[model samples]
Target: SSKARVYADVNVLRPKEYWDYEALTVQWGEQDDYEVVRKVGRGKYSEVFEGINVNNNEKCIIKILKPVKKKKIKREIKILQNLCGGPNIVKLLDIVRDQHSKTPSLIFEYVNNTDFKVLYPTLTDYDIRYYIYELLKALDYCHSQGIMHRDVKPHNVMIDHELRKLRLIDWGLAEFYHPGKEYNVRVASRYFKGPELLVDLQDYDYSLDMWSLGCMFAGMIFRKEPFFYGHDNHDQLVKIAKVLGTDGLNVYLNKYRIELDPQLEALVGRHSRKPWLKFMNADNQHLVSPEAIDFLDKLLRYDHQERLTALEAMTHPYFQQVRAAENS
Candidate 1:
């Protein structure tokens, strides 16, 4: 069983009421107060719309959750409430449900977000550093509070570039951390899945998010939409092994006493670790500096324990300028 090197005892120190989300009684708001304006996005679990609060005529996001288990809904609301007002965290303005069908909807403060696909291309080196540092604050805060955002990716990170605001959104997969407890490996998106999840390491901790952040960072600097372009679950590991190399994977498996499925082993075959420098090109040269590569190296380690914690990552030299600007 694995425990986070930092904040291992955060939940242990808190009262049971704080993390016992299953017992949470959600206070539902009036559904009639908010009216849908137009569709914004849709995901496997929810349909999102741009909405307006009629009382104040203020814009908001209405996320109408698709049918799922009651427990899952409670978990999301509880986690959101627990993290409300934390740095770079999305604000859950209200929770409402359809009176006729009982369909639940979550209202959030509207963020004028440019889609990441459109936004990432426009970011300068300093902009990338500043936003990533902001993301780390949200990750570090959640980790410190004994929770893990199992899903961390560009889509979940809402950025209002005009306001220079960043918010970590989507907590449907987030869970409270309990040391040594085995969690579902079917968590993060395929592209952002950490080696621990891909290799069936169920006891992973907050370090998992760091891996996803690393993937996001790599894509930003290397100009690859997904740094690891895996077509399927098994191929995902193969994709990761191609760059990180099977040697480190073997070491990680040995350390964790994990044995790969024979079929999977054959598919992975063998590969030498590709040098990070090889990814740099004229397109992304401005974004890839020595410090950026060094920071990426630390986050993309095969072993989760070796990956930098969110708190540790915030102090990396790659973010020195961002920190300096914050201080001034």
Candidate 2:
């Protein structure tokens, strides 16, 4: 089995109990304090609603987690608490559970997010850089605190267009990163699946999030809904291979000793790396630059170890102007 070329944050790989969800003591709160306004979003994990805090007359999000394992519920809560007040992280207010069924709910600070489909096509070059840097802040903070947000995609990134605000939401698939530990690869969304996940590499680390973020970056810069569109898990690698090159992918698999079945081997035939500049178009040229392309290149590597950590990515030249503006 191949290991990550660089485990950037060794401090995060802690003890088993530290990563254990059973150790959590959830102090269930009063559900009556919050009232559902309307449904906001729904996923396999939970039903989300735009809720109101009756006590303070403020807006909040109520995430009524689907009937999942009690341990999963605690893990999300513990990670949120550990990351509370970090840059661009969704704030958790309370934890509540059903009186009868014992169903759990989490309350969060509400964000006025514009749908990415509606908002992405309208973004200025600065907006893309700005939001990505904001996202990196959240990712870096969470990684430093010993958590990996297994899910990172446009949908999970809430963008308040008018206010230029961004928050990284969803910790359902997130897990603690322990060096040399094997994790389930069936975590992230299909389109954003990193090579490590696609090849069944269980020893992935925080760089998984970077690959997902790179997918988001690719979509924004190329104006494609999903830069890599895959019909199935194996096909997903096929889609990635079509552009990222099956040759480099083969090398990556061999370097890690990850063998593919004959069917997948036949499916993922040899493909040469496509030039990043080929994606630049009249519609998306405004978002393309040498710096942006370079930044994306560092994140979408076939090897997770080669991908930039959130901290390292923040210093990339693409964000120079955005950082300057933010500092000013």
Candidate 3:
């Protein structure tokens, strides 16, 4: 109850029921409501397979947790139960626990076609802003209820083959923000990590997710290289400082009322790029529309608390087209 929430909402949002992939008991050789089509991917820890819930012909992805890695399955399930239920988040159909081996299996609504990277190759600036706006809306909703997603990377984002909409996943290292207490379970914050993590601020919250969304928007704006990243922990911080600048770095320090180490301070001084370094360009505030650059700027702020939330992002001009379409 106190260690941290991998991904749970504090506002007690009720999960709405949607069409689900049928429920089938966990058994290796047993075939019931769902039939495995083929193995999609295999990692050392788990196997991802494609299947169809035979009863309603609903397609789905079945992620079977490794017998030795049941903990990951539990944490992932926790995130799904809390974060999902809206159009912005992924839908969790079912979770099956194995009695024989103590491992668990997850069944989710099959979202296929392509991932963000694959989708990026053919994306227009409009497309990128559209999706980013959607993601911000989702992130805002989660944070509104005090939910913070520690992992916010592209691979974690999936786009339906046709809709090209974004769905964020992977809550392996997420935690609840408790004032004055160490997050305790520190996972790889990587691109989404705030400066506080670098200086070791024990007390933090959902704003970390905002930082990550900033990194993601950076990549989309750049549309070439990945977000500011490092091969390891040390490089990751350097990459962050290179972008945030000295004053920006100090802003983070000021927020937490702490000091940065010598290396981090020096790293801040290494920045050589322009302030508007970008993946794409918005002509100006008025030329492109308000949502165009406004929402991106909000997500990629120097201050975490100032970062926009889900509901706040929905109000951006980028989604004006989307909203207009919905209204029409």
Candidate 4:
């Protein structure tokens, strides 16, 4: 049973009315006000489209959610409403639903986002620091407000290079932290999954996002699309173990008293920890600094408790330049 090092009592201090999302009553907007322009993206849970608000002629993102439980829908809305004006948090303009089919859609402020694959390649060393710092602001704000963004990946982070704006989107997998509660381990995407999730430790907290951020940061500096390329759920753990080594994994399992399946244990057989510096090369040498490696080392630990909190991460030396520029 792990708890966040900071903001552990945010929900405990606040009234039940603040965190009891199941009691939320959403004020639905009119579906007729928005018109779909074209399909922009698709996910298992949503069909996204670039849309126009006919009344004011404003551009917006219309995320038409696939049929799911009403409880899940309310959770997303409540989390978004709670985090409405926080730094880098995506703004939810309105919520609407179809008249006949009763299909629900979430209207959001449109971000002219360049895809990560196309955009990350062009970012300067300072650009990576600046944006990661921006992202930490969102994560820190949400964690302080008693919420955990279970899914933190490049796809969910929207960046508009022209405006230098970053927004943390897709709160569908986000959840409120209730101390000692066992959360579902099947939340984050395969490649970004932390050691806790793979070993069935359910009481994870905000640090989970930090681990995902670490994976993303590693990819940015190393020029690897996905730092941990796994074929399946079990293979994901093997991939991480191969780099982090089975020794740390063994200690982590022992601490949690977790017993991995025999097959998985055999698959993740003994391996030595690989050095982080080994990943640096000519193409990424400019982006890889001593501070960068130090920051990454702290984040990619086998024990979740050892990982940096979002607030602490923003203060790391790797982000010193970004912080300096912000104040200047």
Candidate 5:
């Protein structure tokens, strides 16, 4: 990849350390009609403060954007506005701009519930499955409209406890999928990025979000990332291959024949369903309805072509469970 446009550069997407929050500190204040409450959190280049929107008297979130991300902020504002409703996504209330520097910011619905991580301790199996189902539904809608949310993780998704909502937020890293470009993995395009995009010749697909869904499930079950923790992309793949066997890796790269590392080959055998236990706590959760589990199985397969597509996943029986659960 050329330096012309660094897409998903690790430095940009995944920073080694959290940004220096103090550097961007500001004396954020609220309007006379509306009182500024307190600081919510901070992002790479912004800070969030809970505030009341007067006139209508609705509670709102304030995102103070930096001058550097002005353009990106505008783009995110437009994208979030486009994806407006649905119980699964966050609602964008307004966009703010600094009067002095003229930098833009965003205002959204204030949230109170912790991320899925907090819920991991006691959340039921059904809760896990329904959460993924909701996320998949949101992704399905986004994909249908040619939108691909690049950054997906527990933190990005917030729970609106007041409304019992699972809201997908943060468009700062969002990207509209390029048409027919073989982009997959919501994170990496297996075919397009190819082996170059990963450590091994891992297969790629349009269902990258499914891969993430699997990871998120893995985290929920294990209470931590099942994949490599401190390792780079190559290490991540080695761990991935260990869980999903050598033959399974080869299964993905049929023509290319991805030969696993000798150590990994000797350690982990064929891709069995055993790892499901490592991630799914069957004692408390349903492990997702059998049908949904089956669908998740295919979605997380070694072979990209074999993974369930968005359209196919949308029409899945698991969705039926989601609907049933949603209604109930």
Candidate 6:
């Protein structure tokens, strides 16, 4: 995996049960106990709803799984169960199936979360660091449990800021890490996708999520809705190269001995690295700081091995204020 893994030993050294998906035994729950209140969100794989648990009159999320492989469904359920009681994980309450359609649904603890588009623009500098630190808790916990969240972005992060609560959601793309295993590159959102994904690097791991987190962090501090606005996958690398510089990307590629797919050849060429300060403006100047710039610099490197791990990032000086505030 090109030394891209941080917890590679956890996967390599763990017992078979830690990485086994085929042995998962899912316990189905009663569907009638919950009823949909409204459609809250939609994705390529699921339709989300604000639902009510009739027995207790409490709110919950109803994730109606779109038609996908039964194995995939089981994998998610297994991972959720393994991650149960961990910090900031979206709690999976039950598994239910629609009677008529036989479509399966996942019941989850409801979060009164604001859309990131609306929420991020309203966040103070402290709020961004606080939430991202909370997000790292979720990432680090999952990785420590031998899982990699292949999809990580703002949409998957549910934040109830008033409560200072954050939940990492959407585990469908997640997989247990088996050291040296090649995973599908077709994971994560376009704007948030890592350079490894764009380069068709399949043997990725927990570090991939750090890349997505970097993109999210960049977007927040810089006031760019998407730090890298690539129209497509080929252009995604181009967007990254424009900032990271093509010379560095080539160095990274040569280090890994990668050959760009034909489609990416014309799309990529030598470009100078842009300075981080260039992204700041009057609107977002208040969010700029030495620590913030240094943190982003560590996370956005083209070489995955060069990026900071979730645990290490939390301990960095950038989070000093966050840590001090928690103590105070």
Top TM-score model: 1
Considering TM-score, which of the candidate structures 1 and 4 is the better prediction for this target?
1
For model 3, the local distance difference test gives 0.62
lDDT of 4 by residue, 220-242 (tens): 99998699998987899999999
Of candidates 5 and 2, the better by TM-score: 2
TM-score result, candidate 1: 0.99
Clashing residue pairs in candidate 3, if any?
5-176, 140-309, 140-310, 221-279, 221-280, 222-279, 291-317, 291-318
lDDT of predicted model 1: 0.95
For each candidate in the order shown, give its overall lDDT on alpha carbons.
0.95, 0.88, 0.62, 0.93, 0.56, 0.90
Clashing pairs in 4: none
- Which prediction has more favorable lDDT, 2 or 3? 2
Worst 10 residues of 6 by lDDT: 1-10
lDDT of 2 at 125: 90
Better of 3 and 6 by lDDT: 6
Model 3 segments more than 4 A misplaced: 1-33, 41-45, 67-73, 176-181, 261-273, 277-291
RMSD of each: 0.7, 1.8, 6.0, 0.9, 8.9, 1.4
Better of 1 and 3 by TM-score: 1
Please give, for residues 97-160, the per-residue lDDT of candidate 1 as tens digits.
9988899999999999999999999999999999999999999999998999999999999999
Q: lDDT at 70 for candidate 2?
A: 72
Per-residue error (Å), model 1, residue 70: 0.8
Clashing pairs in 6: none
Candidate 5 lDDT over residue span 167-260, tens digit each = 7777776554432344333353222222223534323323555566656655564555433342544555556666556665665555555565
User: What number of backbone clashes does candidate 2 have, counting pairs of residues 3 or more apart or in separate chains?
Assistant: 0
Taking the tens digit of each residue's C-alpha lDDT, what string does model 2 give over 134-160? 999999898887789998999999989
Error of 1 at 115 (Å): 0.6
